[PDB]
Amino acid sequence: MSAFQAFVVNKTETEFTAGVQTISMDDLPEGDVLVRVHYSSVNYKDGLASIPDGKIVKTXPFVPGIDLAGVVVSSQHPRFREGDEVIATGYEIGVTHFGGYSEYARLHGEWLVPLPKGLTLKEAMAIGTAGFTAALSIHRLEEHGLTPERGPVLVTGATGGVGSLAVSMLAKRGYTVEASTGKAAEHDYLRVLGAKEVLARELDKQRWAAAVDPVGGRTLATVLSRMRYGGAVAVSGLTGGAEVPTTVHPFILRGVSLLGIDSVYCPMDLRLRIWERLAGDLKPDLERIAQEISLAELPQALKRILRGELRGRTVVRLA
Amino acid sequence: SAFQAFVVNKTETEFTAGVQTISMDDLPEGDVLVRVHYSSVNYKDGLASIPDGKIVKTXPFVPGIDLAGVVVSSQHPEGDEVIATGYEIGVTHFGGYSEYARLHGEWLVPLPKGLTLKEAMAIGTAGFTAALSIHRLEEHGLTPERGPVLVTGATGGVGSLAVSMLAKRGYTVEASTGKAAEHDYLRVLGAKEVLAERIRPLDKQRWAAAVDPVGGRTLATVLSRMRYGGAVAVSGLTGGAEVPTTVHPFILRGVSLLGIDSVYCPMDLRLRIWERLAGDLKPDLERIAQEISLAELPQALKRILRGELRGRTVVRL
Numbered sequence A: 001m002s003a004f005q006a007f008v009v010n011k012t013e014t015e016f017t018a019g020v021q022t023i024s025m026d027d028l029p030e031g032d033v034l035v036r037v038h039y040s041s042v043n044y045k046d047g048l049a050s051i052p053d054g055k056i057v058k059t060x061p062f063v064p065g066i067d068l069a070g071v072v073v074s075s076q077h078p079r080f081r082e083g084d085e086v087i088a089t090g091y092e093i094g095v096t097h098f099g100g101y102s103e104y105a106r107l108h109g110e111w112l113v114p115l116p117k118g119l120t121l122k123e124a125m126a127i128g129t130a131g132f133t134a135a136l137s138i139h140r141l142e143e144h145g146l147t148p149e150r151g152p153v154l155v156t157g158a159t160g161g162v163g164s165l166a167v168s169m170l171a172k173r174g175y176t177v178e179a180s181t182g183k184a185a186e187h188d189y190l191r192v193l194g195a196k197e198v199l200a201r202e203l204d205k206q207r208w209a210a211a212v213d214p215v216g217g218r219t220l221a222t223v224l225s226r227m228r229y230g231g232a233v234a235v236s237g238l239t240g241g242a243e244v245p246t247t248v249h250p251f252i253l254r255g256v257s258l259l260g261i262d263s264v265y266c267p268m269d270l271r272l273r274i275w276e277r278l279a280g281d282l283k284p285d286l287e288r289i290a291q292e293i294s295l296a297e298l299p300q301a302l303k304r305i306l307r308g309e310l311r312g313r314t315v316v317r318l319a
Numbered sequence B: 001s002a003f004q005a006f007v008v009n010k011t012e013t014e015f016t017a018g019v020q021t022i023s024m025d026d027l028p029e030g031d032v033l034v035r036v037h038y039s040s041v042n043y044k045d046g047l048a049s050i051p052d053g054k055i056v057k058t059x060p061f062v063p064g065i066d067l068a069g070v071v072v073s074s075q076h077p078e079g080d081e082v083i084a085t086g087y088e089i090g091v092t093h094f095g096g097y098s099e100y101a102r103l104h105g106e107w108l109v110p111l112p113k114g115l116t117l118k119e120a121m122a123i124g125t126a127g128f129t130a131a132l133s134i135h136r137l138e139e140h141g142l143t144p145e146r147g148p149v150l151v152t153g154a155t156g157g158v159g160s161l162a163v164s165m166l167a168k169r170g171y172t173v174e175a176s177t178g179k180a181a182e183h184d185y186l187r188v189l190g191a192k193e194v195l196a197e198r199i200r201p202l203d204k205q206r207w208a209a210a211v212d213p214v215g216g217r218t219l220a221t222v223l224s225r226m227r228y229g230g231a232v233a234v235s236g237l238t239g240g241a242e243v244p245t246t247v248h249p250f251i252l253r254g255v256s257l258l259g260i261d262s263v264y265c266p267m268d269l270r271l272r273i274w275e276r277l278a279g280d281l282k283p284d285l286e287r288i289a290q291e292i293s294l295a296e297l298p299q300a301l302k303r304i305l306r307g308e309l310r311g312r313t314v315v316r317l
């Protein structure tokens, strides 16, 4: 009792550790809500938190994991009584504040999202930050004019977390989806998620009514060449390094919008709206996208996402 | 008198591009009359063989940035084997997709010893660009002991030729392409390994130089795996839109970006590059060149435009 396991990253005098070890209740930082973590997931950002030069974590003894789903053990009066299934993504979690790769997490009441009717904690983590990023992107495109009747929608990080999830969300909304990836042997998978066409990495001059780029932008010059007049691109994520900028001219000439999607600091009112959508009209096909691993299998998954060999979504069952 | 030529034309009804017979009066002014033996198909030539290819602006025109043949009449220091590359040859002044071509002597380069007319065109603009690239890199300090050289030209004209050239030069070459069927082909040119950005493994400084023949398309990923001091030779055009780079990576590692212009290259260097092309920069053309007749030219022009031509293709008139 009061002694549980967590993936911990450390950095002393020219030495780096990253493994599952046992930690205590007192190692958890200041919070007003105590949560027993049922699930977490693996994100690329979480991969960067597991390595020294990742440029995410800037403080030593740390518990990564930007994603959380579980049950309230104890807390305060922030609208949370024990036994409540709560979700926690974004903010300082897994970056500045101890995160979800732990059996227990201690957080601020202002960061929790009461689990919407229509989602399991596992399904909530299967979606995770990635799904939130995908949902917000589509949400944002839709208030900007996107409907299935405007034309096909391109998605470029198709096999990754955000990409797989977006394809699914768009296909189930009735959109004609074209998906692009850089790995062959990924085509069948993309079609199963509902993509009508799949593109090998590389009508005249205006095919897509909208696009979703979850790779920091880095295929923007490709996406801009075949954008319809009035279209938009929702961009999010990181590349891998090596920034890829765009010219501005193509946005001006075709009246196209670039919508920066940030899942970290999204305000609570919108956050709640997105989670309602994720429980209803933007609920993806998690059975064909997500796979589950245990806390002890986590190190390997963080290596893989960093190397770019993780497809779809990976949820971590805690304990 | 009345010879054959490939003619592009565009009125206010249609666009015509076929092989018609034109006379001596159709060629524009020039002091040197060259009877063309060989020409070459180039990406640039394909754009000039089409409407919305933004290269040919005046109406009735004969494309072909590349010229090689024998002199009929001249008044500049007859029967001289000569090559013409770049300048106004593909673009503003009538080209080499014609049995005869009139040009100015300022563009002409006497065909170097150790090279054939067909070989000069197997090389052509593409080979020149590549050779001029390598050259520009070597005078920046690049040598085989600095580390491997990362081409990206792959099966572009330029690039295929770059690999062969660097391989024959003794460099370790890493070639990049997106087509899975050209892997065996790139090793025969002499590339040590074929590449299919990730931040594990350690790829963080491993290329001494780079040849980027797609308008700096791949600069963004190249730059973050350059050795401290290296350079990158960029040339040609992209498939369409322009892809910018950040400047930080250059300052950070003391890397240079070298703009390679084949079009308006100065004569003094032009000869030096061609002498090199007849010398230690002679690519193994046995594997990289192909030959077609004039009546077959339009077909290749259609293929290069849709990226269906590997290596180099010459033309016999």
Ligand SMILES: [Cl-]
Pocket (backbone or CB within 6 Å): A038, A121, A122
């Ligand atoms: Cl559970």
